[PDB]
Design an enzyme around this catalytic site. Structure first.
Site, PDB file in Angstrom:
ATOM      1  N   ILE A  10      20.186 -21.733  -6.564  1.00 46.69           N
ATOM      2  CA  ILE A  10      19.968 -21.946  -7.995  1.00 46.69           C
ATOM      3  C   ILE A  10      20.769 -23.140  -8.536  1.00 46.69           C
ATOM      4  O   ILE A  10      20.696 -23.462  -9.712  1.00 46.69           O
ATOM      5  CB  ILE A  10      20.316 -20.667  -8.815  1.00 46.69           C
ATOM      6  CG1 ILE A  10      21.803 -20.295  -8.664  1.00 46.69           C
ATOM      7  CG2 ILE A  10      19.432 -19.516  -8.400  1.00 46.69           C
ATOM      8  CD1 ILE A  10      22.193 -18.974  -9.340  1.00 46.69           C
ATOM      9  N   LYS A  32      28.840 -18.634  -5.405  1.00 48.55           N
ATOM     10  CA  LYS A  32      29.194 -20.019  -5.161  1.00 48.55           C
ATOM     11  C   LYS A  32      30.011 -20.104  -3.860  1.00 48.55           C
ATOM     12  O   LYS A  32      31.060 -19.468  -3.728  1.00 48.55           O
ATOM     13  CB  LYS A  32      29.996 -20.542  -6.344  1.00 48.55           C
ATOM     14  CG  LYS A  32      30.413 -21.983  -6.275  1.00 48.55           C
ATOM     15  CD  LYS A  32      31.032 -22.382  -7.610  1.00 48.55           C
ATOM     16  CE  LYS A  32      31.873 -23.620  -7.524  1.00 48.55           C
ATOM     17  NZ  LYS A  32      31.077 -24.857  -7.766  1.00 48.55           N
ATOM     18  N   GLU A  74      29.056 -12.787 -12.107  1.00 48.30           N
ATOM     19  CA  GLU A  74      27.916 -12.170 -12.776  1.00 48.30           C
ATOM     20  C   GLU A  74      26.760 -13.153 -12.867  1.00 48.30           C
ATOM     21  O   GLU A  74      26.975 -14.347 -13.050  1.00 48.30           O
ATOM     22  CB  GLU A  74      28.274 -11.723 -14.192  1.00 48.30           C
ATOM     23  CG  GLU A  74      28.585 -12.843 -15.142  1.00 48.30           C
ATOM     24  CD  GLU A  74      28.762 -12.401 -16.591  1.00 48.30           C
ATOM     25  OE1 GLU A  74      28.164 -11.374 -16.976  1.00 48.30           O
ATOM     26  OE2 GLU A  74      29.523 -13.069 -17.324  1.00 48.30           O
ATOM     27  N   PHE A  75      25.547 -12.625 -12.757  1.00 45.67           N
ATOM     28  CA  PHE A  75      24.329 -13.433 -12.768  1.00 45.67           C
ATOM     29  C   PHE A  75      23.774 -13.502 -14.199  1.00 45.67           C
ATOM     30  O   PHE A  75      23.569 -12.476 -14.825  1.00 45.67           O
ATOM     31  CB  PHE A  75      23.257 -12.824 -11.826  1.00 45.67           C
ATOM     32  CG  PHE A  75      22.011 -13.655 -11.734  1.00 45.67           C
ATOM     33  CD1 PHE A  75      22.026 -14.855 -11.024  1.00 45.67           C
ATOM     34  CD2 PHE A  75      20.854 -13.296 -12.415  1.00 45.67           C
ATOM     35  CE1 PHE A  75      20.907 -15.690 -10.979  1.00 45.67           C
ATOM     36  CE2 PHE A  75      19.706 -14.120 -12.374  1.00 45.67           C
ATOM     37  CZ  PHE A  75      19.731 -15.316 -11.646  1.00 45.67           C
ATOM     38  N   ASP A  79      19.740 -21.401 -17.302  1.00 45.50           N
ATOM     39  CA  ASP A  79      20.749 -22.369 -17.806  1.00 45.50           C
ATOM     40  C   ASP A  79      20.193 -23.092 -19.019  1.00 45.50           C
ATOM     41  O   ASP A  79      19.007 -22.995 -19.324  1.00 45.50           O
ATOM     42  CB  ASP A  79      21.260 -23.306 -16.694  1.00 45.50           C
ATOM     43  CG  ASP A  79      20.221 -24.343 -16.219  1.00 45.50           C
ATOM     44  OD1 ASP A  79      19.345 -24.760 -16.966  1.00 45.50           O
ATOM     45  OD2 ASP A  79      20.310 -24.758 -15.070  1.00 45.50           O
ATOM     46  N   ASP A 120      34.083 -30.697 -17.173  1.00 48.80           N
ATOM     47  CA  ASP A 120      32.756 -31.162 -16.771  1.00 48.80           C
ATOM     48  C   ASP A 120      31.630 -30.351 -17.424  1.00 48.80           C
ATOM     49  O   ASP A 120      30.676 -29.922 -16.765  1.00 48.80           O
ATOM     50  CB  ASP A 120      32.639 -31.165 -15.225  1.00 48.80           C
ATOM     51  CG  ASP A 120      31.423 -31.964 -14.722  1.00 48.80           C
ATOM     52  OD1 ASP A 120      31.033 -32.937 -15.397  1.00 48.80           O
ATOM     53  OD2 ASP A 120      30.847 -31.593 -13.667  1.00 48.80           O
ATOM     54  N   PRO A 123      24.704 -29.213 -19.777  1.00 47.05           N
ATOM     55  CA  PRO A 123      23.696 -28.147 -19.957  1.00 47.05           C
ATOM     56  C   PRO A 123      23.462 -27.285 -18.702  1.00 47.05           C
ATOM     57  O   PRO A 123      23.208 -26.095 -18.850  1.00 47.05           O
ATOM     58  CB  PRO A 123      22.427 -28.928 -20.321  1.00 47.05           C
ATOM     59  CG  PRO A 123      23.000 -30.178 -21.076  1.00 47.05           C
ATOM     60  CD  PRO A 123      24.244 -30.514 -20.317  1.00 47.05           C
ATOM     61  N   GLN A 124      23.552 -27.884 -17.515  1.00 45.90           N
ATOM     62  CA  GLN A 124      23.396 -27.169 -16.223  1.00 45.90           C
ATOM     63  C   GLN A 124      24.480 -26.117 -15.940  1.00 45.90           C
ATOM     64  O   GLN A 124      24.217 -25.138 -15.230  1.00 45.90           O
ATOM     65  CB  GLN A 124      23.292 -28.153 -15.063  1.00 45.90           C
ATOM     66  CG  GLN A 124      22.224 -29.193 -15.277  1.00 45.90           C
ATOM     67  CD  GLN A 124      22.771 -30.531 -15.825  1.00 45.90           C
ATOM     68  OE1 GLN A 124      23.234 -30.657 -17.000  1.00 45.90           O
ATOM     69  NE2 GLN A 124      22.742 -31.537 -14.952  1.00 45.90           N
ATOM     70  N   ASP A 138      31.525 -22.799 -14.105  1.00 37.66           N
ATOM     71  CA  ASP A 138      31.848 -23.941 -13.245  1.00 37.66           C
ATOM     72  C   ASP A 138      33.050 -24.734 -13.713  1.00 37.66           C
ATOM     73  O   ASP A 138      33.026 -25.971 -13.674  1.00 37.66           O
ATOM     74  CB  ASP A 138      30.646 -24.883 -13.131  1.00 37.66           C
ATOM     75  CG  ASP A 138      30.622 -25.647 -11.818  1.00 37.66           C
ATOM     76  OD1 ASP A 138      31.295 -25.225 -10.857  1.00 37.66           O
ATOM     77  OD2 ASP A 138      29.895 -26.648 -11.741  1.00 37.66           O
TER      78      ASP A 138
HETATM   79  C1  LIG Z   1      16.114 -22.599  -8.880  1.00 32.66           C
HETATM   80  N1  LIG Z   1      16.344 -23.689  -9.815  1.00 32.66           N
HETATM   81  C2  LIG Z   1      15.125 -24.463  -9.977  1.00 32.66           C
HETATM   82  C3  LIG Z   1      16.809 -23.180 -11.102  1.00 32.66           C
HETATM   83  C4  LIG Z   1      17.816 -24.083 -11.788  1.00 32.66           C
HETATM   84  C5  LIG Z   1      19.067 -23.370 -12.221  1.00 32.66           C
HETATM   85  O1  LIG Z   1      18.701 -22.068 -12.691  1.00 32.66           O
HETATM   86  C6  LIG Z   1      19.669 -21.098 -12.788  1.00 32.66           C
HETATM   87  C7  LIG Z   1      19.300 -19.806 -13.089  1.00 32.66           C
HETATM   88  C8  LIG Z   1      20.274 -18.835 -13.179  1.00 32.66           C
HETATM   89  C9  LIG Z   1      21.602 -19.199 -12.969  1.00 32.66           C
HETATM   90  N2  LIG Z   1      22.580 -18.225 -13.029  1.00 32.66           N
HETATM   91  C10 LIG Z   1      23.958 -18.286 -12.937  1.00 32.66           C
HETATM   92  C11 LIG Z   1      24.663 -19.389 -12.448  1.00 32.66           C
HETATM   93  C12 LIG Z   1      26.052 -19.258 -12.461  1.00 32.66           C
HETATM   94  N3  LIG Z   1      26.903 -20.290 -11.967  1.00 32.66           N
HETATM   95  C13 LIG Z   1      28.198 -20.152 -11.515  1.00 32.66           C
HETATM   96  N4  LIG Z   1      28.743 -21.295 -11.171  1.00 32.66           N
HETATM   97  C14 LIG Z   1      27.776 -22.257 -11.433  1.00 32.66           C
HETATM   98  C15 LIG Z   1      27.808 -23.641 -11.269  1.00 32.66           C
HETATM   99  C16 LIG Z   1      26.688 -24.384 -11.607  1.00 32.66           C
HETATM  100  C17 LIG Z   1      25.561 -23.778 -12.114  1.00 32.66           C
HETATM  101  C18 LIG Z   1      25.507 -22.403 -12.289  1.00 32.66           C
HETATM  102  C19 LIG Z   1      26.629 -21.661 -11.947  1.00 32.66           C
HETATM  103  N5  LIG Z   1      26.687 -18.138 -12.810  1.00 32.66           N
HETATM  104  C20 LIG Z   1      25.887 -17.156 -13.228  1.00 32.66           C
HETATM  105  N6  LIG Z   1      24.559 -17.155 -13.323  1.00 32.66           N
HETATM  106  N7  LIG Z   1      21.968 -20.458 -12.700  1.00 32.66           N
HETATM  107  C21 LIG Z   1      21.009 -21.391 -12.620  1.00 32.66           C
END
Ligand SMILES: CN(C)CCCOc1ccc(Nc2cc(-n3cnc4ccccc43)ncn2)nc1
Length: 277
Positions: A10, A32, A74-75, A79, A120, A123-124, A138
């Site tokens: 992700i 991560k 946690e999920f 983003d 840092d 939006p991501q 992050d």
């Molecule tokens: C498959 N791609 C096309 C989709 C693009 C991105 O989509 C998503 C969908 C759901 C999530 N969920 C998260 C992510 C995090 N997280 C922890 N450290 C991070 C460092 C960077 C980014 C996210 C980080 N923590 C909890 N939930 N993150 C991205």
């Protein structure tokens, strides 16, 4: 780690991020895996396990086994980048922009009171849920330069909490106008896009700027533009707040705490986003 079933990649942080499932508990998590561990990093990371706030993505667990480091979070389902892209035809409604800005300021005020900088923001790494929350992910210990504070770009080694306010200001502007405010593709391009919009900084607006490591006397001299031109859809309260978040001088730049008291937030509410998951 045998405990986790990777579901999908992700993202990319200092490592790759996967959606994973805890094979024993059933928990769905963001995992991560950190890029290649120093005694100093382990102890610094373990302190982040106690930095808990409604607007910080919860670090559930740190797995140091055995040479790699995995951080189990946690999920959250989406983003902010994706949500902005999904909202690009109509734009994110102002009340929801304002709620998200307020909550991120809450997260930062908390982090900053413990002298922890993000460094840092983009939006991501801002994560949203179906009940209207937005969370910082992050926290640092092709790279996007769009949200980088000018003091970082000018070579300041010991920059402050003010860098995060700058980044959040750039993100606020972007939610509002649906275009990145300073989309530089190199450090000097970034710096000159900032200069072109806000004026080349000098000693009047930023005392000591000319003494910064990467400052050149030979930088071009651009005049400042109006914020009416920079973020047209925004009302005067939002523009006033934004201007304070984008002050060149990191010591004049508004704090997260002070920003929470800004009149822009007099009518803040917590709408729920319409999310396509
Ligand atoms: C498959 N791609 C096309 C989709 C693009 C991105 O989509 C998503 C969908 C759901 C999530 N969920 C998260 C992510 C995090 N997280 C922890 N450290 C991070 C460092 C960077 C980014 C996210 C980080 N923590 C909890 N939930 N993150 C991205």
């Amino acid at each position: 780690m045998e405990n986790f079933q990777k579901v999908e990649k992700i993202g990319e942080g200092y490592g790759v991020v996967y959606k994973a499932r805890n094979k024993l508990t059933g928990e769905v998590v963001a995992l991560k895996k950190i890029r290649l561990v120093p005694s100093t990093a382990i102890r610094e990371i373990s302190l982040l396990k106690e930095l808990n706030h409604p607007n910080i993505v919860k670090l559930l667990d740190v797995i140091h086994t055995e040479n790699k480091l995995y951080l189990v979070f946690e999920f959250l389902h989406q983003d902010l980048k994706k949500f902005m892209d999904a909202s690009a035809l109509t734009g994110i409604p102002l009340p929801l922009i304002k709620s998200y800005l307020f909550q991120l300021l809450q997260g930062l005020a908390f982090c900053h009171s413990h002298r922890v900088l993000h460094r840092d923001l983009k939006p991501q790494n801002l994560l949203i849920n179906t009940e209207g929350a937005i969370k910082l992910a992050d926290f640092g210990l092709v790279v996007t330069l769009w949200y980088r504070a000018p003091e970082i770009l000018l070579g300041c080694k010991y920059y402050s909490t003010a860098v995060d306010i700058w980044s959040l200001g750039c993100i606020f502007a972007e939610m509002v106008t649906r275009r990145a405010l300073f989309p530089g593709d190199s450090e000097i391009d970034q710096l000159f896009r900032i200069f072109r919009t806000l004026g080349t900084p000098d000693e009047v607006v930023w005392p000591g700027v000319t003494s910064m490591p990467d400052y050149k006397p030979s930088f071009p001299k651009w005049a400042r533009q109006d914020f009416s031109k920079v973020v047209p859809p925004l009302d005067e309260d939002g523009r006033s707040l934004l201007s304070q978040m984008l002050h060149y001088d990191p010591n004049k730049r508004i704090s997260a705490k002070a920003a929470l008291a800004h009149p822009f937030f007099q009518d803040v509410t917590k709408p729920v986003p319409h999310l396509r998951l």
